Structure formats: structure tokens, C-alpha cells
Amino acid sequence: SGSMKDYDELLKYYELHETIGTAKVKLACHILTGEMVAIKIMDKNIKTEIEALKNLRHQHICQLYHVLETANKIFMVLEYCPGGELFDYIISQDRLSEEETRVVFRQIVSAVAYVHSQGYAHRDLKPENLLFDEYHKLKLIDFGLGSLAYAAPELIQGKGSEADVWSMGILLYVLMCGFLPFDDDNVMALYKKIMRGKYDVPKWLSPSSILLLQQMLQVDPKKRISMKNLLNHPWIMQDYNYPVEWQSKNPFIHLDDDCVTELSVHHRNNRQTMEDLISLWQYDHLTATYLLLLAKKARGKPVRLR
Numbered sequence: 001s002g003s004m005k006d007y008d009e010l011l012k013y014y015e016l017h018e019t020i021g022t023a024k025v026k027l028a029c030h031i032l033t034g035e036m037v038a039i040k041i042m043d044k045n046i047k048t049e050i051e052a053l054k055n056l057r058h059q060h061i062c063q064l065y066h067v068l069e070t071a072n073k074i075f076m077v078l079e080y081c082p083g084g085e086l087f088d089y090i091i092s093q094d095r096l097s098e099e100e101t102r103v104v105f106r107q108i109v110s111a112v113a114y115v116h117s118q119g120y121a122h123r124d125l126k127p128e129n130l131l132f133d134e135y136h137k138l139k140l141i142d143f144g145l146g147s148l149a150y151a152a153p154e155l156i157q158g159k160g161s162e163a164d165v166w167s168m169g170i171l172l173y174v175l176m177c178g179f180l181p182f183d184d185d186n187v188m189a190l191y192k193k194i195m196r197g198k199y200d201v202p203k204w205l206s207p208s209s210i211l212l213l214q215q216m217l218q219v220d221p222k223k224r225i226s227m228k229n230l231l232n233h234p235w236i237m238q239d240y241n242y243p244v245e246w247q248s249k250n251p252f253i254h255l256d257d258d259c260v261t262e263l264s265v266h267h268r269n270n271r272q273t274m275e276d277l278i279s280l281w282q283y284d285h286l287t288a289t290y291l292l293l294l295a296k297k298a299r300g301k302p303v304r305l306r
């Protein structure tokens, strides 16, 4: 409602800053560690879609620190990405070079690789759900599930890991062309173009780009390249010479000694109790404190609390 009494349980742990997004989205501060976060504040009147994010932990998937649920609201503390929408960056520069695109597109593959490993399909890969962090590294976000220009042909018919490969195809195209491969003023026509499968091939595109694009943008799902072959594809490996490392560097089971020690001093508990406690991953204040500590370390900053 209009009520400000919900923000009470929140402001225990967090100190608010400006609004964005108006779900309303506020930039906040985690009091104990001082790290910036981003709170998705939702007014009841998708529960499971949260449980999804609880199991996903990966350096290009937007991290979930804390869930606060009252009878009047639900708050979602998430990694704050300063760099903004990938969409805005593409328009910002008209179009990306192959070398740059490759840097970005490798991060997108790593994430989508990973999500699939956990048996989830993102089903909404558009450059509006890829945001830059301060490192200018990419972070995937919306697991709510148009958007139509990114829909695989099979989804338009009715009838998938493979549909994600189609959208990554549309991504690669836009990244390197700066406009969509299938686009129109008239929706029914846009349906049509997509289903046909024919797109322009701008002069500035290398044949490697054209090859990969062709293998990803297959109108038939089975003829579409597979996640396996994509990871080490010759285009993907071009300046790197190692395949995409999609493996999570942020585990549920490997806890951090440096981080647990500091937390032990604050809660006045021993290393065993604390570790057992953190390992429950309740996504309460403890989960947010440990995770935000890891990040606080990942900046090479002091592993201290307030």
C-alpha cells in the first residue's frame, strides 16, 4: 500500500539511497559491510522464481544476497550494476567490434552455459537483462520466465536449451550490427521474418562471425549449434585459445576461511557453528553478510564489518 511501516524491518540491515526503475528499485547500503546493493521492492497485490535464484551462483549471474518478506511487502537485495543496460551500451557506440563483442559474448555464454547446467532455461535473453558492473563485466538478470525479436522460431509456432542458443544468436548479431536481424513496424510481419530465417549480413562482418551466426540462428532447433560445441567454437576461441570457462567460481559448499573468521568475531561463535550456520543458505542477513564479504574481499578491500 502507501504504508511506510514495511521499510522498518529492512532499515535494520540496510540504509536506503535513491529510487530507480519506477517493483520499485532502490539503491541501498548493507550496514554491516557498507557495500552498495539494489533492492527490488515489491508490493504483494514468482515466489518460486526466487527459489531459482537461490540455487544460481555464478560471476555473470546477478547475485541474490537477501530476501526480506513481510505480510505487506517482499524485498530482494541484489548485486547493484552501475554500468547499466547492455542495450544502452550498444546504442551508446552504434555497434561493437568483433574483438569487443567476443569479450562480451564470452561472458554471456559462460552464464547461459551455467544456468543450463543447473537445468534451467532463461527464456528471455535480451540485452535489457544484461547489465554492466563497475568492472564493466556483464551480469545476467531476469528469470521471471515477449520479447518477440528474440523469440526462437519454434516458440512462435508453439512447441528448451536450444531456444536460448537462438537468442544468444540474436544477441551476437545486435552486438556486432547495432540493429536487430529480424525487425519491423508491423508485428505480424516480424513474426513472419523470424519464422523464415533470412537476415542481412552487413559488409563489416567477418566470415567467422557469419559462420557462427549461421550455426546459432538455425530455424530448426536440432540443426542449431549445441551448448557443448559453442563453448570451444573457433570463433569463440579466436583470441583466447581456451574454451569458455563457465564453471562457477562462487560455490555453495566451499566457504571462505578469511570471511568465516571475521564473522565468528562478530557473532562470538566458533568456526564450526558459524560454518554450519552459513551453509544453510537461508538468504537471510547471514547469507547477505557472507556474500557481501566475499565481494568485499574480491575488491581486495579489508575483510572487516561495522
Ligand SMILES: CC1(C)C(=O)N([C@H]2CCc3c(O)cccc32)c2nc(Nc3cccc(CN4CCCC4)c3)ncc21
Pocket: 020, 021, 025, 038, 039, 040, 062, 078, 079, 080, 081, 082, 083, 084, 085, 128, 129, 131, 141
Ligand atoms: C535489482 C536490479 C536487478 C533491478 O531490478 N534493476 C532495475 C533497475 C533499473 C533496471 C534496468 O534499467 C534494467 C534491468 C533491471 C533494472 C537493476 N538495475 C541495476 N543497475 C542499473 C540499471 C539501469 C541503469 C543504471 C545506471 N544509471 C542509473 C543509476 C545511475 C546511472 C544502472 N542493477 C541491479 C538492478
